[PDB]
Symmetry: C4
Subunit: 254 residues, 4 copies
Amino acid sequence: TLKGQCIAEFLGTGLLIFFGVGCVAALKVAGASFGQWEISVIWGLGVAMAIYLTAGVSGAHLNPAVTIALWLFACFDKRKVIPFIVSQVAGAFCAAALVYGLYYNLFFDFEQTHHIVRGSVESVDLAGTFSTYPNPHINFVQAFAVEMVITAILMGLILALTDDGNGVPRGPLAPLLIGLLIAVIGASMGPLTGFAMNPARDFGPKVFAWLAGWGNVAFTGGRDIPYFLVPLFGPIVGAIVGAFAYRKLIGRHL
Amino acid sequence: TLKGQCIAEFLGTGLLIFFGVGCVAALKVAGASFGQWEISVIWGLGVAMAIYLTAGVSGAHLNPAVTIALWLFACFDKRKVIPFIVSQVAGAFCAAALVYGLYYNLFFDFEQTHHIVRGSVESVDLAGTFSTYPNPHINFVQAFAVEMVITAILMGLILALTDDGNGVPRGPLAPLLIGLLIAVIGASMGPLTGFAMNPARDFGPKVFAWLAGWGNVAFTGGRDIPYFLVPLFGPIVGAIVGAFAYRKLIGRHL
Amino acid sequence: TLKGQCIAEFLGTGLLIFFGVGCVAALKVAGASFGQWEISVIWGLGVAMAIYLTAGVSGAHLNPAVTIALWLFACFDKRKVIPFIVSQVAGAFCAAALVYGLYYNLFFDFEQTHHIVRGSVESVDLAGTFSTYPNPHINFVQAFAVEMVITAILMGLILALTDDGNGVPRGPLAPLLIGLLIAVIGASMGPLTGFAMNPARDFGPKVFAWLAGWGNVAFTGGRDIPYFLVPLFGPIVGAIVGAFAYRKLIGRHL
Amino acid sequence: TLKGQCIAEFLGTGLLIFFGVGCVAALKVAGASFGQWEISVIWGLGVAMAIYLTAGVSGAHLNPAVTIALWLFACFDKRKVIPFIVSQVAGAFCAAALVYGLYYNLFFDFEQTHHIVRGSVESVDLAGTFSTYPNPHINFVQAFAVEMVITAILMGLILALTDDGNGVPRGPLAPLLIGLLIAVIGASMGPLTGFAMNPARDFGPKVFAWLAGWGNVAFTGGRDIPYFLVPLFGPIVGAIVGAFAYRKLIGRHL
Ligand SMILES: CCCCCCCCO[C@@H]1O[C@H](CO)[C@@H](O)[C@H](O)[C@H]1O
Ligand SMILES: CCCCCCCCO[C@@H]1O[C@H](CO)[C@@H](O)[C@H](O)[C@H]1O
Ligand SMILES: CCCCCCCCO[C@@H]1O[C@H](CO)[C@@H](O)[C@H](O)[C@H]1O
Ligand SMILES: CCCCCCCCO[C@@H]1O[C@H](CO)[C@@H](O)[C@H](O)[C@H]1O
Ligand SMILES: CCCCCCCCO[C@@H]1O[C@H](CO)[C@@H](O)[C@H](O)[C@H]1O
Ligand SMILES: CCCCCCCCO[C@@H]1O[C@H](CO)[C@@H](O)[C@H](O)[C@H]1O
Ligand SMILES: CCCCCCCCO[C@@H]1O[C@H](CO)[C@@H](O)[C@H](O)[C@H]1O
Ligand SMILES: CCCCCCCCO[C@@H]1O[C@H](CO)[C@@H](O)[C@H](O)[C@H]1O
């Protein structure tokens, strides 16, 4: 039932963001010690749990880029395309809100302690608690390239791991392995754009931050070209390229 | 045999606290390097081991909140409800005592080194070695909300992971995955209330600390409203809400 | 064939020490960043690998305390008892030697840099690279208690994990889980005595350190009562107590 | 089809280097916090993913030393030997290039910030981002010994883990376990030579660094004897010794 699938996608994506934005809020406003690998592994395992919870129902896309790619390469009913995306983005929105609710006091106290004007350019750092932003040394096109390449690897490997005709089937290991993949991607490329590779994961929370007092910098990141466009279309282009790559270079030889 | 189940629950919950309070004592009074994720993963894996050890006998509840929820939603014999809880809380008590025994010298030396009067408000930090306390910036109601939300996610996901009708069965992976779930919960929400989500895990050791010279602050946390009430009823309310949520939003669509 | 089993035990125990003493040498004389959990997880996974390699042949005891316990409670041929132990201790000896060989230069340079006289009381720290020593604040009897309690938990849980009549069988997961158990034990109790819980793991390398210029302090640890006696008999007493505990409190109710 | 196998090997080895060189670039020029175990576990899991992706096709050698050893001890068609190696080294080359592309700006900014002349002896540190180099305190022969011993353990354990006649078969766990093995090897021996143990993994990226402005020091490491020769032939000699060791000391007794 399509209604039960949209619900799962809503809970899955939200669950996913709950852990991700949560551990990052603890790092930013709670003074918790986290390394590049810790933040990555937590994001990865969060997604792994999000999958185990919703896989049996919606198939656990929990990613607009993934939904679109499966539609164009995995025979995924297009009628279910938009419903999924609207659910995925909605869950990411609510999750970010919920995480903000539990960390409410820590955000305000932190900003007062370090004289941070929420909404200003200098506040983009705490805004990074919800969505991704470009590294200081790279630009729009560079950031678009990174998100594209990584999402391709994500989609490409997801298919490989889920492809039962590829080596010994992983069975119940697939979800966990997909989480570890996300872990290593965020540890090797994270410093560049925050390994968004999920339109819903970035736009949803971004919209929340925008409402939560961060204003326009939540979308722009304090740059000339509105940054939100990168985590929005970058993952999509990559998810397709990656999906195509697997089918040709690997699938065709199985 | 109910007697053999209460024993398992006693050993399981104790084993669980042994690792948890143990790694936290090493962090607090042993000067060991631990990050928010390390402490969380150790707690998670400790519970994972506690499950593998007692699952085959008592079903491995090792959590009053869980026992009650299974009673109201998993057809768990109510006659076994109180016996379990009394065993779970007892094990947590003994474990905390045992951990204190092995770390005896380190506690006293630490307090002398940093002029800490055990029992005073400033000693709540070392008291945190046994039970959970609220973050400085949040209050009673806020702390109750956090514990409630997380325990709901705990119960909700536990059912999902153990639900054989939900995607590929995890089999022997279930326990480990439940531990990783606890890991990501403590890393994303830990800084707020110490992710207690287990009445026995918090009250048992709390009672020990109270006897061990920490006095009343072990229960109050140095606040107006006795804090021990949050980790006591907060998890219970959440465990039910979570259990209900899974049955409706997910189970009903499987 | 008993000869092929002693070889496996020799390679297993050695492999085990290779990773353990290796990561600890990198921490002590290589300036590598390791936390209490990292060192523990590396020791745990090293043992996990040591098991996968020798389990199919010798049964992978890789621990004198374990061999003795299996003899008294798992119907392990006593004729194979001494042969195993002599092999296990021999492997630990060679491994420690090999690790010292690869880290040769780093040890001498470190000692010169920090004016450390190998063999003196202050050199026990680098001697800790091979075997375990008591925490500054605890004494002989305290250290004996710690090693005893933990080894009991080790043996107790090993049986539980390997007991196919206890919940869902772990199959190929058993070894890994036994490694994670060792990981959480070393993270919760490590700071006290270095979680030796393996006579061969401590005595073998200790004898090497003694020959490598560390002298008598390698055995005494710079204390009144020769410390080597704790990691020697402490684990044995615990391995038995633990083995007994499982059979009674858990096995008898399966 | 040999063409489809060379492609897999090209993608596998590249994928492998993508994560490895990637996380190390984040550590060196992105200021990311990584410990000796984190870098090791990321390298290990990267290889684990590289295997799951290509195992079903090429058998996932992803290592010249491994290919040669399987040829001499696993009945691996020699006709496929060179094709594999040329593919493996090519993938490592491209991967290193790709990683450099995404981190382009960070490298130049870092060098300017810390006045580092790319190509000079002091630039070997950033060159370490792509290939391995010897620890300051050890020499050519010492470095050759280390790489040899570890690669032997790698090959030896790989066979053990993949040997279905050795204890309970690991099935879909094999790849992950091989990654964890690489993890513990890099954490115990890493500080000595960067646990290359893969001719393609070191030479490929080394050639890239050489073209990328690092010049001759990329091959020499700033030493008398050209260092690149160690990660080139060291792993090969060890891979054979290790392969032989397993067949004799373990295989012969199964
Ligand atoms: C789930 C529905 C959530 C709707 C958005 C709630 C956002 C609450 O966020 C609030 O936004 C205000 C407006 O900028 C700010 O002034 C406050 O500081 C901020 O707390
Ligand atoms: C499913 C996601 C669809 C996204 C469509 C584009 C939404 C763009 O969002 C817009 O960005 C502008 C630029 O900063 C802001 O000025 C506007 O307030 C904001 O609404
Ligand atoms: C398993 C049974 C344990 C019973 C409780 C033992 C507590 C020992 O704890 C002791 O408590 C004393 C009283 O406050 C303090 O004065 C001591 O400092 C403290 O070590
Ligand atoms: C199963 C757990 C039941 C718990 C029932 C409530 C126990 C409350 O405990 C009480 O808290 C008071 C307030 O700090 C203290 O003054 C008392 O000494 C203490 O006994
Ligand atoms: C595998 C067989 C190994 C035998 C022991 C070799 C120990 C080498 O160790 C050496 O011991 C000497 C004697 O104290 C010291 O003077 C040297 O500094 C030390 O390197
Ligand atoms: C299988 C292990 C058997 C160990 C038997 C006891 C070995 C004790 O070892 C002895 O310890 C003494 C005290 O420091 C030293 O003076 C001696 O040199 C040393 O040989
Ligand atoms: C995939 C094909 C890649 C071919 C090699 C590209 C190397 C680009 O690297 C460039 O090399 C130049 C020459 O040293 C340097 O001057 C530049 O600083 C460096 O960016
Ligand atoms: C498959 C790998 C084959 C490697 C063959 C040896 C390549 C050596 O490479 C050479 O090293 C010299 C010494 O620094 C440099 O001067 C040369 O520029 C370089 O081409």
